[PDB]
């Protein structure tokens, strides 16, 4: 389901994989709240990408 959500995100947000992989910064989940991908789908991605995040979370 997460992979299909990723495909659906790529449908709208475009090729955001490079943007996601480049703006790494610091880890939000460890074994923090330091979110770094907010505004990634600000103009086009939006809900799909948000859903994608949720799924992978």
């Amino acid at each position: 389901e997460a992979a299909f959500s990723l495909a659906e995100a790529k449908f709208t947000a475009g090729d955001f994989s490079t943007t996601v992989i480049q703006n790494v910064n610091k880890a939000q989940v460890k074994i923090e709240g330091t979110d770094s991908y907010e505004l990634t789908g600000l103009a086009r991605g939006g809900e799909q990408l948000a859903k994608l995040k949720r799924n992978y979370a």
């Binding site: 992989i21 790494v24 910064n25 610091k26 880890a27």
Partner: peptide, 10 residues
Amino acid sequence: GELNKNRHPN
């Protein structure tokens, strides 16, 4: 993801 002190990705 995170870049450590050596900037090494995980």
